[PDB]
Write a structure and sequence with these properties.
Layout lengths: L18 E7 L5 H17 L2 E5 L6 E5 L4 E3 L7 E6 L7 H12 L14 E3 L46 E3 L15 H10 L3
Helix pairs in contact: 1-2
The structure holds zinc ion.
PDB class: hydrolase
Keywords: hydrolase, hatching enzyme
Assembly: monomeric
Amino acid sequence: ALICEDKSCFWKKNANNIVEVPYVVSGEFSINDKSVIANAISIFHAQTCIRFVPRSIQADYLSIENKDGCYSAIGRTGGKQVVSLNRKGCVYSGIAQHELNHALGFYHEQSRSDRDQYVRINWNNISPGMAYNFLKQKTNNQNTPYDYGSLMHYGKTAFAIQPGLETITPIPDENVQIGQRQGLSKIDILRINKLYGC
Ligand SMILES: [Zn+2]
């Protein structure tokens, strides 16, 4: 999780013990795209106290837009904040879950402060100018273990300089699988519930 002692980087929780995260979706998204976004939302609704709600008057909200890739800000940043789900590349339930989980305050798994115990970064295989994506970040690991199966973990060939080259090798067992985009892992869900006191 993001470190933010005062909790101002996170979404507020109401007197019903629900974290309302308001959002809008661009008119460019189709009816099928909206079904996928609902499916992503439904995973959070089934297992956490987070509720993604259509925005009305709230100052702080997510704007789901058809921009250049799949991305989100980390945590609540103030005012309108963008979640891009490029319509060509990103409209899949697990990818949507991944971006929404960034908005809740989570970094990529391999950005964990202790990541060097679990993966090797093969810097020579990373596209030029993309190494910043492999930086360790200032993480609160919430007393949870590293999760190779996290929805927030890059796959082995993320940002490869040439196709198929491996930028991340799990250690000591290189055959562990990383980079699933099926859905939030058990540990991803635990971390949400812990951060928001559900
Ligand atoms: Zn991400």
